[PDB]
């Protein structure tokens, strides 16, 4: 479906500037850094805990394989 | 009126690549489609240029691949571009599928199923590609994996010897593996066009899982400029491997020629199969192991039926998000475990991981959807 | 050569009238005339 | 060299009139007795198609050349229809008059009306009419005439819907061949010499020749659910050229014939104040005066809210009754004359409107009456003549037309 | 006096013919500059290790 | 009313040059375009540098590999072949005849009839030094290896069909169309020759 | 079956942009020549490969001429032996693997062309192997011929300690200690397995710089085009 | 009753409210929902259109609204329920009749 | 009697000035009717945000009485002498004029003077005309043309007084007291900002003396603090899209920054705009029209109507086009329109520029027909240019334009420049600003 | 001729991690060499020692080359 046949919209105004009138990086660090920390804080304890568990099951299983190959004092 | 909408060839290009209405809000996870296309073209070129110097005879094969890397001008950079390009393909593929799972793009059933076929074909291609150098892991990998089909009752043993064209992986096997490996990418090319042909019936999903018809932007320039940037970052990843770590994702044992006596210590496929290799080894019975390895990929075709949430994307769905990232972490565990020897504690961890894989897809993520619904009074 | 006071389109919604001050001048006083051209928009007069 | 109008009537009937004023621009108008009135029930809307049909291919010039050639030199070709006349008009800078004149003669004296071009043009009848009928004055005035007459003036300027797609090439040829003739034509000019116009008219406009309007009195009522009701009520008036017609024109300006001040309350308009006394919600009223060769219509046009249409029309009609009964002072009739006198001179102020009056007169009368003589004829209208015009309207058989939600619009016999 | 970017626009970037010629010229000048400059950085980083640096000992 | 609509303030987003609402942006328009198109132009020069190198390498691949260039040329020692005798060599999977020619063989092949030959070539343009003639030992008609110091014309003779070559390698009497082929070569130091 | 993996020695080519020490390669070749080449083959390296790396054209021609090699047939139909040239590969010790086993008590000496690439640890591994030979610990003994090396898998190898102090004199007069001889031969075996190394890293540098330039430029082009949408303000104005 | 504490928590965790969306804006459009949407009155439809457009625009920038402007849990009107309920109730009637 | 000659003997425009600074300008001819009026450098551009729409509010009150003629006395006197009284307000120019019998010019000038200077502005009359303006503001919402042009200005000259509408926001209309209106008047209605223009049958000498008699009291001094100078207005490359699918046809208005009144380039730009020209669905020409945009539009039924404009303000303006089309035609209209701008920039021909010249020659010679448009040309030209420019001078500027000029002049304003876009209605198809902006250049020239 | 290797191997041998591992090595040396008939050996203890030793050797052997 081409533009002109997508959907019905009414009473919605959109203002915008030319890209030659404006900056590529407005407040890039000023507002970017806090928005990143907000986004990171928001997803951290959905994303991270499984990978912490992988790190633990990995480092546990690796050095358990090393101990198992050593002799037992008997 | 213009000669972009009028001319039969430009019409197709204008509607599928320029004036294509795309959602305003699609994220970086939507770039992997175009990057898979770039990977496919990249493999075909590098591949074709390698095929100008390679030979599929068992005696000369390993030597031809080294002759490429030593004597052919820039044959090394082509060779290792092609090998790491296969890794870049699979990275791109799993990211692309994960996007589909998380954001529920799989509701586009036809697009999704053709996807599954594409995945399976790129696997078949890359399995047979790794055999062509005719090193140890090539030869021994091909031997063990092919011979899994002997586990089928009645016919299995015949089937395996018919693939081989003989009683082991030898002269007739390598030559046909070169022929099939050449033709399949072109078949992928065609199936990928059918893939998009279905995608353009619905247009793209977006991160919200909510219809974007009220906020469509033309593909050009917005996503043509993003795809350039994406391609640039794909080439960085590729060339970082080719120029600073060409052997990192391969194996040393594929630099000794194939020896039918001398077995390598811990024979394994390339990193992107290790998850499914681990699932195979979890199950003690061999036929059961093959049916689990088969179901570990084909379960992708089941995913759409298992959808229970009244919301499409996982964006607004915390339980599912966690279970999804558990499923990813589990696959990372299966890849780790797949690369290990069959011993304690890698057997038990592998079993536990393999149960968790199927448990997450068939039981927990469906339940989570229904719980989320009842939390919203739905 | 000169464009008309009003560009004419078909199927375009009419301009509403909400007061005396805009409605005066409309009451017809003389019989109709119809002009058509090459360059100027078509008009209908009182 | 200050210049005045020249005038000629050839023995074949055709009138040439031309003021050489040495302006940069040159207006030429070929006026023809070929308005909608000369249609019958078999070829209705033929003159409408004919009006749209200039710039179709002619014998001496293609459809392409008429458009491109005229545009090339910055020019204009217009075609204007009343009920009684058609007027083909060309403008340009004075150096390109003989190029435009050649096109004008081709259009009027030798059109081909090719089957494929004529057929291709049929949808334009629908578009042109559709546009025109956006103005509700067009509905009402076209219906008013249709109600008021049995035959010629009843005809609409626009082609009836059923005829659209069915006006034939033969009908267009017939219409031109029977109406575009020397005895029915006047060639008017500004910024061109009279002798060269005369010689064009002798050499290219000598072409051989080819019923009275019965007043009826009726009503037509367009029910359409608008919140405003347009309505016109008229009676048979007087033929243009007669002295009685001047009395109606003065009565028109006594009663009120459209606005003088922007956003003004119309303090001198007798109708507007008569209506505004009773009803203060949005409305408009004006005296309506059409005047033709055979006949005329005089009355008034209301625009009112649906519910108040009854009150507005009766109020307006009552105002004419007091004028007809004798309530009419000199200061009103003097003011009304000053309006009419000023309006006429202002209408011929531009060289567009001047051309229209020169050609208009040339068909309906023998020759040109100058502005000073017209103003003297307005002054000749006595207060007695105005009261007679009003009296004629009150006792005259009425014609009416309305459009809107007519639930409270009265019929003629409710008035 | 107009700014540097403005001089670049009016002289080189406005006509697409000059814009293209500019890129092709710039690419030649860039190629040799970048190659020569990057090779210097490489060979300084590996001073005395390359055949180029030890060539003179056997000629 | 639509007159109530007022366009939002874009000051946070605007470029410095167009912040001042009381000044004309036309001064800065030349500049603002310049900046953005410089970025585009610089990018294209970078991509050109890349694509040139990428394409050029791929093209280089198809040109002769290092092992094929290794067999391209062959060194021959001129003091190891005595005056009169032929010496055969292996060159690009072919025989390669080098021949030290005597005072007699030089002068006898110098004053030969130019027209009588089937392939007219004079001797001083078939060789670079008069006393050395280097030839491919492939008989031109249907491919054999000619035997040295034999034939009627005292040079090379083939027992396959019936060809007779002179001491300069030119066909004299037989079915061969072309003469024996003169390869590309150059003498380095006076004792050595590289063919190829 | 315990395992001791090698430590990471600070090689002169360890870093991202660090090239091979070509003087170390020149020594390392001589350690293959003088010591290994009677036991190990190195089939993929020819005498021409040395040119423009560790030796000149003329030096490499001398090294090639020193060795015997079979060629044929001649017109008689016989296989003769001739002095080598640049086109010849490094000559195999034995005619075949079965012959090689007999000369080394069953064990086959692997080809060294790719041994750095074909073993985990690479040059770190080989250096540790060559210098790590020691007397066995108490409770241990292997078959007569299998020596003890702590870095070899399974703790026992069938190679006699090949290097020691002054096992050869180097052409540039470097004191040939066991550690020096191992370091040099490893540097050569690194190059043997990966000739591209130096070009590869030169390319790496040029890629890193081009990306340092293009990524932020293309990212700026992206932000420029997208600034129309990122700035935009929306308003809902229902009647 | 007792799980109303968890419902309130989950609502904010889900976080569609941070884009000024109501729950019924996030519902996945199947054929029933499409029909239910199609039956909305001018006002409810155009508000839906805007709310989504605003969310999509926020999503594009990877930003959220100010906390004042977030959809309150209590004020989340279930605007689509009565239309969707009947669309489904209708379909099940046809499906019954078809057997 | 040729065209070049005709221009030489067109009546000259007389020019005199009063002590206070009021300019009296006159074109005379033996005509029984005349038009006379006052043109003022006043409008929305001179208004701040807190008093926007004051000049429009005044316009409503101007003809509703004076101190000398209270209420409908002013109205009655105009009507009873057959005179026609009229006003208009633009962003830079307010104007009141009267069409009258030539013999009644003294009274005409007297009445104009009474309106301007002694305007009643009654309490009750203000509160009545308050609701009237609110209903006009509502009528104006139904005119998509009016709305889209107000939007073009609003976005084009955003954050300046040129962004403001003439009528003002309804908030101001509802609150403006009579104190605001009288303050607005005494600041802006000053003799040096004003012109008394007249055309028809009238001796210039008599008009000057009539101006003395009635407009002498007009103030033409400014106090030490403040004097109404217009600041320049920043054009912004911007877009405003009011999406409303419930309407049947889409209005689009697009333009680049024009040069403004004084600049000679305006003549070449008029010629270029004449080439592209204008069209609507009632035009007889269709496919055979000379303008490629019009012939393409007609044959493919792209739009219902379009015109090119060139709107001039002091140090800036709006140069472009407006069109009205089907919701599926907006992309194609824009493509062909922008395509014409590029073709004129890069590759305009001599014969088509000759056509454009001839159109423009005809345009402004036939526009000055009747006393009212001539009076208006006198009034405004004195404000914009500082003088009336005779037809002979326009002709000289027009003959100077050849194909090379049209290229160079169009390339200055159109080629690779950021436009302002306004769309209203079913504008889903309306191209993205980047696609519009990229359509302001060709990858060839 | 003295090898830089054997010098540094001694230097590294006298660190806490080496000498503690060397005592572990010597413990089982005179446990298995004193006891009769047990198939236990001392490979593990040697490898613990070498891992710690040769890690240190690596850190500064290449200085002398
Ligand atoms: C929602 O986004 C969509 C929608 C539809 C499509 C679609 O139909 C197709 C065919 C692709 C696609 C597939 N393969 C390769 C490319 C490609 C090739 C070269 C490029 O140039 C560059 F790398 F920049 F140099 C850039 C992209 C694009 N991508 C899509 C993305």
Would you report the helix, strand and coil content of chain G in percent, each value rounded to 5? 40, 10, 55
Q: How far apart are CA D272 and CA B79, in angstroms?
A: 96
Q: Which residue has the tokens 């790496």?
A: G204
Number of Cα atoms under 13 Å in the Cβ half of residue I168 = 27
Contact D343 I82 (CB under 8 A): yes
> Which subunits count as partners of chain F given 3+ CB pairs below 8 Å?
A, B, E, G, I
Q: How far apart are CA I261 and CA G94, in angstroms?
A: 99
Most A-contacting residue of I141, I241, I256 (CB-CB within 10 A), to test interface: I241
CATH number, domain containing residue C23: 2.10.210.10
Q: Which atom of ligand 1 is nearest to the CA of B22?
A: 1
The answer regarding whether domain E1-59 maps to CATH 1.20.5.260 reads: yes
Q: Could you tell me the two tokens for G133?
A: 């030979």
- Residue C13 in contact with partner chain D when CB distance is under 8 A: no
- How close I59 comes to chain C (CA, Å)? 13
Query: Which of F47, F64, F81 delimits the end of a domain?
Result: F64
Q: Treating both helix axes as pointing N-terminal to C-terminal, what angle do B75-102 and B61-70 enclose, rounded to 10 degrees?
A: 100
The H or E element containing residue G209 is: helix G197-231
The H or E element containing residue D80 is: strand D76-81
CATH number, domain containing residue A45: 1.20.5.210
Q: Could you tell me the two tokens for G210?
A: 């081009």
Consult the annotation and say whether F161 binds a ligand.
yes
φ, ψ at I128 (rounded to 5°) = -70, -55
Q: Which residue has the tokens 């799989």?
A: B106
Q: How far apart are CA E50 and CA F53, in angstroms?
A: 23
Q: How far apart are CA G49 and CA H45, in angstroms?
A: 76
Pocket of ligand 1 contains residue B22 by CB under 6 Å: yes
Q: How far apart are CA E53 and CA I105, in angstroms?
A: 103
Cα of B194 vs centre of ligand 1, distance in Å, is: 15
Q: How far apart are CA G155 and CA G139, in angstroms?
A: 13
Most G-contacting residue of I247, I434, I437 (CB-CB within 10 A), to test interface: I434
DSSP class of residue B195 equals H
Q: Give the determination technique.
A: X-ray
Cβ atoms of residues I40 and I194 within 8 Å: yes
Q: Could you tell me the two tokens for E55?
A: 């060539």
Burial readout D195-227 (b: 16 or more C-beta within 10 A, e: otherwise): eebbebbeebbebeeeeebebebbbbbbeeeee
The residue range of the domain holding J58 is 1-65
Contact I33 D91 (CB under 8 A): no
The residue range of the domain holding H28 is 1-99
Q: List the domain boundaries for chain E.
A: 1-59
Tell me which residue of I82, I92, I91 sits closest to I34, measured CA to CA.
I82
Q: How far apart are CA G180 and CA J9, in angstroms?
A: 15
- How close C14 comes to chain I (CA, Å)? 7
Tell me which residue of B99, B96, B82 sits closest to B39, measured CA to CA.
B82
Q: How far apart are CA I407 and CA I241, in angstroms?
A: 31
CATH number, domain containing residue J19: 1.10.287.20
Pocket of ligand 1 contains residue B105 by CB under 6 Å: no
Tell me which residue of B212, B208, B207, B202 sits closest to B23, measured CA to CA.
B212
Q: Could you tell me the two tokens for B193?
A: 């066009």
Residues 6+ apart with CB under 8 A from D299: D232, D233, D234, D235, D287, D288, D393, D398
Q: How far apart are CA I413 and CA I191, in angstroms?
A: 36
DSSP class of residue D123 equals H
Cβ atoms of residues G127 and G120 within 8 Å: no
Header resolution in angstroms: 3.1
Query: In chain F, how long is the greatest CA-to-CA distance?
Result: 116
Domains and CATH numbers, chain G: 1-195 (1.10.760.10), 196-239 (1.20.5.100)
Q: Which sign, positive or negative, has the C-alpha torsion F146, F147, F148, F154?
A: negative
Q: Is D380 exposed, middle or buried (0-12, 13-18, 19+ CB in 10 A)?
A: exposed
- Which candidate from G10, G139, G178 shows the least CB-CB separation from J41? G139
Contact G229 H60 (CB under 8 A): yes
Could you count the other beta carbons within 10 Å of the beta carbon of residue B330? 23
Cβ atoms of residues A7 and G217 within 8 Å: no
Contact D78 C34 (CB under 8 A): no
Contact A46 B346 (CB under 8 A): no
- Which candidate from B52, B67, B74 shows the least CB-CB separation from F57? B74
- The string of DSSP codes covering chain C is -PPPSS---TTPPPPP--SHHHHTT-S--S--EEEEESSSPPEEE-
Consult the annotation and say whether B82 binds a ligand.
yes
The residue range of the domain holding C30 is 1-46
- The interface residues of chain I toward chain C in range 338-377, judged by CB-CB distance below 8 A, are 359, 362-363, 366-367
Query: Which of F64, F85, F113 delimits the end of a domain?
Result: F64
Domains and CATH numbers, chain B: 1-378 (1.20.810.10)
Q: Could you tell me the two tokens for G167?
A: 């096992």
The residue range of the domain holding A43 is 1-74
Would you report the helix, strand and coil content of chain B in percent, each value rounded to 5? 70, 0, 25
The residue range of the domain holding F163 is 65-196
Consult the annotation and say whether F160 binds a ligand.
no
Cβ atoms of residues D122 and D165 within 8 Å: yes
User: Kindly report the CA angle at G226 between G222 and G227, in degrees rounded to 5?
Assistant: 115
> Which subunits count as partners of chain A given 3+ CB pairs below 8 Å?
B, F, G, H, I, J
Nearest CA owner, ligand 1 atom 14: B37
Q: How far apart are CA D80 and CA D51, in angstroms?
A: 7
Q: Is residue F161 flagged as an active site residue?
A: yes
Instruction: Report whether the peptide linkage leading into residue G73 is cis, meaning its omega lies within 30 degrees of zero.
Output: yes
- Which candidate from A12, A17, A25 shows the least CB-CB separation from G228? A17
Q: Which atom of ligand 1 is nearest to the CA of B26?
A: 1
Most B-contacting residue of H1, H2, H28 (CB-CB within 10 A), to test interface: H28
Nearest Cα residue in chain J from G177 = J3
Q: Is residue B204 flagged as an active site residue?
A: yes
CATH number, domain containing residue H13: 1.10.1090.10
Could you count the other beta carbons within 10 Å of the beta carbon of residue F103? 10
Contact list, I144 vs chain C (CB under 8 Å):
12-13
Query: Which of F49, F64, F79 delimits the end of a domain?
Result: F64
Q: How far apart are CA B336 and CA H62, in angstroms?
A: 34
- Sequence-distant contacts of B62-71: CB under 8 A, at least 24 apart: B62/B133, B62/B134, B62/B135, B62/B257, B62/B258, B63/G44, B65/B132, B65/B133, B65/B134, B66/G44, B66/G113, B66/G114, B67/F65, B67/F67, B69/G196, B70/F66, B70/G44, B70/G49, B70/G195, B71/F65, B71/F66, B71/F67, B71/F68
Named by the residue before each, gaps in chain A exceeding 2.5 A from C to N are none
Pocket of ligand 1 contains residue B83 by CB under 6 Å: no
Q: How far apart are CA B130 and CA J60, in angstroms?
A: 40
Domains and CATH numbers, chain I: 13-226 (3.30.830.10), 238-441 (3.30.830.10)
Beta bridge partners of I41: I93
SS3 H80: coil
Residues 6+ apart with CB under 8 A from J48: J21, J24, J25
Same domain, F75 and F51: no
What number of H helices and E strands is found in chain I? Answer: 17, 13
Contact list, F10 vs chain A (CB under 8 Å):
17, 21-22
Q: How far apart are CA B105 and CA B313, in angstroms?
A: 8
User: Kindly report the CA angle at B332 between B328 and B336, in degrees rounded to 5?
Assistant: 165
Domains and CATH numbers, chain D: 1-211 (3.30.830.10), 212-415 (3.30.830.10)
Same domain, F167 and F98: yes
Tell me which residue of G111, G91, G109 sits closest to G33, measured CA to CA.
G91
Q: Could you tell me the two tokens for D5?
A: 């109008």
């Amino acid at each position: 479906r081409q533009f002109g046949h997508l959907t019905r919209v009414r009473h919605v105004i959109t203002y915008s500037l030319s890209p030659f009138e404006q900056r590529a990086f407005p407040h890039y660090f000023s507002k970017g850094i806090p928005n990143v920390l907000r986004r990171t804080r928001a997803c951290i304890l959905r994303v991270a805990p499984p990978f912490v568990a992988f790190y633990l099951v990995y480092t546990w299983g690796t050095q358990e394989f090393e101990k198992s190959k050593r002799k037992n004092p008997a | 009126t213009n000669i972009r909408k009028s001319h039969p060839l430009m019409k197709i290009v204008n509607n599928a690549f320029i004036d294509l209405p795309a959602p305003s809000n699609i994220s970086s996870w939507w770039n992997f489609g175009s990057l898979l296309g770039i990977c496919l073209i990249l493999q075909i070129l590098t591949g074709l240029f390698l095929a100008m110097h390679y030979t599929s005879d068992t005696t000369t094969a390993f030597s031809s691949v080294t002759h490429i890397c030593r004597d052919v001008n820039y044959g090394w950079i082509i060779r290792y571009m092609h090998a790491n390009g296969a890794s870049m393909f699979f990275i791109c593929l799993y990211m692309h599928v994960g996007r589909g799972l998380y954001y529920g793009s799989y509701t586009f059933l036809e697009t999704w199923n053709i996807g599954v076929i594409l995945l399976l074909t790129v696997m078949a291609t890359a399995f047979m590609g790794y055999v062509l150098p005719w090193g140890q892991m090539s030869f021994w990998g091909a031997t063990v994996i092919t011979n899994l089909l002997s586990a089928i009752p009645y016919i299995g043993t015949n089937l395996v010897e018919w693939i081989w064209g003989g009683f082991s992986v030898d002269k007739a096997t390598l030559t046909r593996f070169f022929a099939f490996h050449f033709i399949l990418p072109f078949i992928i090319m065609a199936i990928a066009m059918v893939h998009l042909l279905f995608l353009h019936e619905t247009g793209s999903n977006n991160p919200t899982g909510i219809s974007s018809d009220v906020d469509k932007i033309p593909f050009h320039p917005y996503y043509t400029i993003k795809d350039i940037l994406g391609a640039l970052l794909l080439i960085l990843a590729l060339m970082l491997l080719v120029l600073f770590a060409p052997d990192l994702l391969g194996d040393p044992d594929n630099y000794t020629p194939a020896n039918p006596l001398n077995t390598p210590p811990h024979i394994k496929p390339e990193w992107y199969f290790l998850f499914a290799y681990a699932i195979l080894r979890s199950i003690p019975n061999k036929l059961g192991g093959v049916l689990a390895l088969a179901f570990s990929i084909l379960i992708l075709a089941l995913i759409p039926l298992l959808h229970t949430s009244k919301q499409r994307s996982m964006m607004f769905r915390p339980l599912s998000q966690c279970l999804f990232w558990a499923l990813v972490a589990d696959l990372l565990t299966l890849t780790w475990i797949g690369g290990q020897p069959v011993e304690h504690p890698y057997i038990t961890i592998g079993q536990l991981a393999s149960v968790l894989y199927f448990l997450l897809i068939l039981v927990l993520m469906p339940t989570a959807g229904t719980i989320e619904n009842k939390l919203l009074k739905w | 050569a000169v464009p008309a006071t009003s560009e004419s389109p078909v199927l375009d919604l009419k301009r509403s009238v909400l007061c005396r001050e805009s409605l005066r001048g409309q009451a017809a006083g003389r019989p109709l005339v119809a002009s058509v051209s090459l360059n100027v928009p078509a008009s209908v007069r009182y | 060299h200050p210049q005045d109008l020249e005038f000629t009537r050839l023995p074949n009937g055709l009138v040439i009139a031309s003021l050489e004023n040495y302006a940069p621009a040159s207006r030429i108008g070929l006026f023809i007795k070929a308005g909608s009135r000369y249609e019958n029930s078999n070829n209705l809307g033929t003159s409408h198609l004919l009006r749209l049909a200039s710039s179709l291919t002619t014998k001496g010039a293609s459809s392409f050349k008429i458009t491109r050639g005229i545009e090339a030199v910055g020019g204009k070709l217009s075609v204007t229809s009343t009920r009684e006349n058609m007027a083909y008009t060309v403008e340009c800078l004075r150096d390109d008059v003989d190029i435009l004149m050649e096109f004008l003669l081709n259009v009027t004296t030798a059109p081909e009306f090719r089957r494929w071009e004529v057929a291709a043009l049929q949808p334009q009848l629908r578009i042109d009419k559709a546009v025109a009928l956006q103005n509700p004055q067009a509905h009402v005035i076209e219906n008013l005439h249709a109600a008021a007459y049995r035959n010629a003036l009843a005809n609409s300027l626009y082609c009836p819907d059923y005829r659209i797609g069915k006006v034939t090439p033969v009908e267009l040829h017939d219409y031109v061949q029977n109406h575009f003739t020397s005895a029915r034509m006047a060639l008017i000019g500004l910024g061109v010499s009279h002798p060269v116009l005369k010689q064009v008219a002798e050499q290219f406009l000598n072409i051989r020749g080819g019923a009275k309007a019965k007043y009826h009195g009726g009503e037509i009522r367009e029910q359409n659910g608008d919140s405003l009701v347009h309505a016109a009520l008229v009676a048979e008036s007087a033929a243009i050229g007669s002295a009685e017609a001047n009395a109606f024109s003065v009565l028109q300006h006594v009663l009120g014939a459209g606005p003088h001040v922007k956003r003004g309350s119309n303090a001198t308009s007798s109708l507007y104040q008569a209506v505004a006394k009773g009803v203060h919600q949005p409305f408009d009223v004006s005296a309506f005066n059409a005047s033709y060769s055979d006949s005329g219509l005089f009355g008034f046009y209301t625009i009112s809210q649906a519910a108040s249409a009854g009150d507005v029309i009766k109020a307006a009609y009552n105002q004419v009754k007091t004028i007809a009964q004798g309530n009419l002072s000199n200061p009103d009739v003097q003011a009304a004359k000053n309006k009419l006198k000023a309006g006429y001179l202002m209408s011929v102020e531009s060289s567009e409107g001047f051309l229209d009056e020169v050609g208009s007169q040339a068909l309906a009368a023998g020759s040109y009456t100058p502005p000073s003589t017209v103003l003297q004829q307005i002054d000749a209208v006595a207060d007695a003549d105005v009261i007679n015009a009003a009296k004629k309207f009150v006792s005259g058989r009425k014609s009416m037309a309305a459009s809107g939600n007519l639930g409270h619009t009265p019929f003629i016999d409710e008035l | 006096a107009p700014t540097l970017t403005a001089r670049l626009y009016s002289l080189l970037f406005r006509r697409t013919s000059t814009f293209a010629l500019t890129i092709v010229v710039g690419a030649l000048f860039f190629e040799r500059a970048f190659d020569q400059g990057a090779d210097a950085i490489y060979e300084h980083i590996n001073e005395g290790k390359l055949w180029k640096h030890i060539k003179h000992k056997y000629e | 009313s639509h007159t109530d609509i007022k366009v939002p303030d874009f000051s946070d987003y605007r470029r410095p040059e167009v912040l001042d609402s009381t000044k004309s942006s036309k001064e800065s328009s030349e500049a603002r375009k310049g900046f953005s198109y410089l970025v585009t132009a610089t990018t294209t020069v970078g991509v050109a540098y890349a694509a040139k190198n990428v394409v050029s390498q791929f093209v280089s691949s198809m040109s002769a590999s290092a092992d094929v260039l290794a067999m391209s040329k062959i060194e021959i020692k001129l003091s190891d072949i005595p005056e009169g005798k032929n010496m055969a060599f292996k060159w690009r999977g072919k025989p390669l005849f080098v021949r030290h020619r005597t005072k007699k063989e030089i002068d006898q092949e110098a004053a030969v009839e130019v027209s009588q030959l089937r392939d007219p070539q004079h001797d001083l343009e078939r060789v670079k030094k008069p006393e050395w003639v280097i030839l491919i030992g492939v008989c031109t008609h249907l491919g054999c290896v000619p035997i040295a110091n034999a034939g009627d014309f005292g040079g090379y003779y083939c027992p396959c069909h019936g060809s007779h070559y002179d001491a300069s390698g030119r066909i004299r009497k037989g079915p061969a169309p072309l003469n024996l082929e003169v390869p590309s070569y150059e003498f380095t130091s006076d004792d050595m020759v590289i063919v190829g | 079956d315990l395992e001791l993996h090698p430590p990471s020695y600070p090689w002169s080519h360890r870093g991202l942009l660090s090239s091979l020490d070509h003087t170390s390669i020149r020594r390392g070749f001589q350690v293959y020549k003088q010591v290994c080449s009677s036991c190990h083959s190195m089939d993929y390296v020819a005498y021409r490969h040395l040119v423009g790396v560790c030796y000149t054209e003329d030096e490499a021609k001398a090294l090639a001429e020193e060795v015997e090699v079979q060629d044929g047939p001649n017109e008689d139909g016989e296989m003769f032996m001739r002095p080598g040239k640049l086109s010849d590969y490094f000559p195999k010790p034995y005619p075949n693997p079965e012959a090689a086993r007999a000369a080394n008590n069953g064990a086959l000496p692997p080809d060294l062309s790719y041994i750095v690439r074909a073993r985990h640890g690479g040059e770190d591994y080989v250096f540790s192997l060559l210098t790590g030979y020691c007397e066995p610990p108490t409770g241990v003994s292997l078959r007569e011929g299998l020596y003890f090396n702590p870095y070899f898998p399974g703790q026992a190898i069938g190679m006699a300690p090949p290097i020691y102090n002054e096992v050869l004199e180097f052409d540039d007069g470097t004191p040939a200690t066991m550690s020096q001889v191992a370091k040099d031969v490893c540097t050569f075996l690194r190059w043997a397995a990966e000739p591209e190394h130096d070009h590869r890293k030169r390319m790496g540098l040029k890629m890193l710089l081009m990306m340092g330039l293009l990524l932020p430029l293309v990212y700026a082009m992206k932000r420029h085009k997208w600034s129309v949408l990122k700035s935009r303000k929306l308003a809902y104005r229902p009647p | 009753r007792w799980l109303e504490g968890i419902r309130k928590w989950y609502y904010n965790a889900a976080g569609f409210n941070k884009l000024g969306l109501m729950r019924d804006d996030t519902i996945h459009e199947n054929d029933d929902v499409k029909e239910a949407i199609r039956r909305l009155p001018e006002n409810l439809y155009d508000d839906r259109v805007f709310r989504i457009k605003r969310a999509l625009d926020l999503s594009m920038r990877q930003q959220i609204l100010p906390k004042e402007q977030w959809t309150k849990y209590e004020e989340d009107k279930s605007y689509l329920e009565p239309y969707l309920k009947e669309v489904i109730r209708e379909r099940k009637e046809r499906e019954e009749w078809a057997k | 009697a040729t065209y070049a000659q005709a221009l030489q003997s067109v009546p000259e425009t007389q020019v005199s000035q009063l002590d206070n600074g009021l300019r009296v300008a006159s074109e005379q001819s033996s005509q029984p009717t005349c038009t006379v009026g006052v043109w003022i450098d006043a409008g929305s551009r001179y208004e701040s945000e807190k008093n926007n729409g004051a000049g429009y509010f005044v316009e409503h009150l101007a003809f509703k009485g004076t101190k000398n003629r209270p209420g409908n006395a002013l109205e009655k006197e105009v009507e009873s002498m057959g005179a026609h009284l009229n006003a208009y307000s633009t962003r830079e120019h307010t104007a009141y004029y009267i069409k009258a019998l030539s013999k009644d010019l003294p009274k005409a000038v007297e009445l104009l003077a009474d309106i301007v200077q002694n305007c009643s502005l009654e309490d009750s009359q203000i509160e009545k005309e308050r609701d009237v303006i609110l209903q006009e503001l509502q009528e104006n919402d139904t005119s998509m043309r009016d709305v889209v042009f107000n939007y073009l200005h609003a976005t084009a000259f955003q954050g300046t007084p040129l962004a403001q509408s003439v009528e003002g926001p309804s908030e101001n209309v509802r609150k403006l007291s009579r104190a605001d209106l009288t303050e607005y008047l005494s600041r802006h209605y000053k003799a040096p900002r004003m012109v008394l223009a007249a055309a028809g049958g009238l001796e210039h000498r008599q008009l000057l003396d009539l101006a003395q008699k009635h407009f002498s009291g007009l103030s033409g001094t400014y106090d030490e603090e403040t004097v109404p100078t217009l600041s320049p207005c920043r054009f912004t490359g911007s877009q405003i899209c009011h999406r409303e699918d419930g309407l049947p046809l889409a209005h689009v208005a697009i333009a680049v920054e024009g040069p403004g009144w004084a600049h000679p380039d305006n003549v070449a730009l008029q010629v270029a705009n004449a080439i592209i020209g204008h069209y609507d669905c009632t035009y007889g020409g269709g496919a055979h029209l000379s303008s490629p945009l019009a012939s393409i539009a007609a044959t493919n039924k792209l739009c219902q109507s379009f015109q090119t404009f060139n709107i001039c303000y002091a140090d800036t303006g709006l140069l472009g086009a407006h069109f009205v089309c089907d919701h599926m035609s907006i992309d194609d209209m824009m493509f062909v329109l922008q395509g014409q701008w590029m073709r004129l920039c890069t590759s305009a021909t001599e014969s088509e520029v000759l056509r454009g010249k001839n159109l423009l020659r005809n345009a402004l010679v036939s526009h000055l027909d009747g006393t009212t448009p001539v009076c208006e040309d006198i009034g405004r030209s004195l404000l914009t240019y500082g003088r009336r420019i005779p037809l002979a001078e326009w002709e000289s500027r027009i003959a100077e334009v050849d194909a090379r000029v049209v290229r160079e002049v169009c390339s200055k304003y159109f080629y690779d420049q950021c436009p302002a876009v306004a769309g209203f209605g079913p504008i889903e198809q309306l191209p993205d600003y980047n696609r519009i902006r990229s359509g302001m250049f060709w990858l060839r020239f | 001729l003295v090898d830089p290797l054997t010098t540094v191997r001694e230097q590294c041998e006298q660190l806490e991690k080496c000498v503690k591992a060397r005592e572990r090595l010597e413990l089982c040396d005179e446990r298995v060499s004193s006891r009769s008939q047990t198939e236990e050996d001392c490979t593990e203890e040697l490898l613990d020692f070498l891992h710690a030793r040769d890690h240190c050797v690596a850190h500064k052997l290449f200085n002398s080359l």
